[PDB]
Design an enzyme around this catalytic site. Structure first.
Site, mmCIF file in Angstrom:
data_model
loop_
_atom_site.group_PDB
_atom_site.id
_atom_site.type_symbol
_atom_site.label_atom_id
_atom_site.label_comp_id
_atom_site.label_asym_id
_atom_site.label_seq_id
_atom_site.Cartn_x
_atom_site.Cartn_y
_atom_site.Cartn_z
ATOM 1 N N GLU A 11 -15.510 -14.946 57.466
ATOM 2 C CA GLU A 11 -16.059 -16.072 57.880
ATOM 3 C C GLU A 11 -15.991 -17.492 57.263
ATOM 4 O O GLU A 11 -16.290 -18.347 58.006
ATOM 5 C CB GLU A 11 -17.482 -15.644 58.555
ATOM 6 C CG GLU A 11 -17.621 -14.355 59.375
ATOM 7 C CD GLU A 11 -17.273 -14.722 60.886
ATOM 8 O OE1 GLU A 11 -17.000 -16.016 61.320
ATOM 9 O OE2 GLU A 11 -17.107 -14.133 61.596
ATOM 10 N N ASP A 20 -15.407 -23.057 65.783
ATOM 11 C CA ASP A 20 -14.532 -21.695 65.548
ATOM 12 C C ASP A 20 -13.254 -21.634 66.205
ATOM 13 O O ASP A 20 -12.662 -22.690 66.614
ATOM 14 C CB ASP A 20 -15.594 -20.696 65.779
ATOM 15 C CG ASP A 20 -15.887 -20.147 67.139
ATOM 16 O OD1 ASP A 20 -14.882 -20.616 68.062
ATOM 17 O OD2 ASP A 20 -17.008 -19.534 67.573
ATOM 18 N N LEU A 32 -22.800 -18.815 65.398
ATOM 19 C CA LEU A 32 -22.734 -19.502 66.518
ATOM 20 C C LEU A 32 -23.576 -20.278 67.124
ATOM 21 O O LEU A 32 -24.708 -19.861 67.175
ATOM 22 C CB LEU A 32 -21.857 -18.520 67.784
ATOM 23 C CG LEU A 32 -21.926 -19.254 68.743
ATOM 24 C CD1 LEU A 32 -20.724 -20.133 69.041
ATOM 25 C CD2 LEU A 32 -21.558 -18.286 70.098
ATOM 26 N N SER A 117 -11.548 3.389 72.557
ATOM 27 C CA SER A 117 -11.574 3.364 70.991
ATOM 28 C C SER A 117 -12.941 4.050 70.214
ATOM 29 O O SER A 117 -12.826 4.411 69.548
ATOM 30 C CB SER A 117 -11.448 1.832 70.409
ATOM 31 O OG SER A 117 -10.494 1.120 70.929
#
Ligand SMILES: [Cl-]
Ligand SMILES: [Cl-]
Length: 162
Positions: A11, A20, A32, A117
């Site tokens: 980040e 971003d 955020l 997943s």
């Protein structure tokens, strides 16, 4: 290497409001602020989060304080989620950091959505889970970062970050 140093690499650190990858107003370590296009709505949220009138600029310590909150909120969101908790419990310590990473970036709702997943992770089918996670908007939008996360998941080592 740990979750904190892993996320700080992914980040970066910015002490001034920025946008971003997606275009949203952010500050510090991937914190955020708002999805709204208004820079003023952003300052407003920023002042709310910090507890002072900031004029869009914070100190390192402030950035690190928001970061500690967000990693904790990330872990707690995983342990509170019926979809996530079980995967997390099933994994080793390295792999755990990698899911925390996904959750920090994409929110618990989003990762909870990677149904297939998660099922392959839980079954410890590493290669297949890797191939499947790459078939996502996530990978397509932030490929270098997705690759690193994916690699941590596939191997269970910190190689991609060393
Ligand atoms: Cl906050
Ligand atoms: Cl990237």
């Amino acid at each position: 290497m740990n979750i904190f140093e892993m996320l700080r690499i992914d980040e970066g650190l910015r002490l001034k409001i920025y946008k971003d990858t997606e275009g949203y107003y952010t500050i510090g370590i991937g914190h955020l602020l708002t999805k709204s296009p208004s820079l003023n709505a952003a300052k407003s949220e920023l002042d709310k989060a910090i507890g002072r009138n900031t004029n869009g600029v914070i100190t390192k310590d402030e950035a690190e304080k928001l970061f500690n909150q967000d990693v904790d909120a990330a872990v707690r969101g995983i342990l509170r989620n019926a979809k996530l908790k079980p995967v997390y419990d099933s994994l080793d310590a390295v792999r755990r950091a990698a899911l925390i990473n996904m959750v920090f970036q994409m929110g618990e709702t989003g990762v909870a959505g990677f149904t297939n997943s998660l099922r392959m992770l839980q079954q410890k089918r590493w290669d297949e889970a890797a191939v499947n996670l790459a078939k996502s908007r996530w990978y397509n939008q932030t490929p270098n970062r997705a690759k690193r996360v994916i690699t941590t998941l596939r191997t269970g080592t910190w190689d991609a970050y060393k």
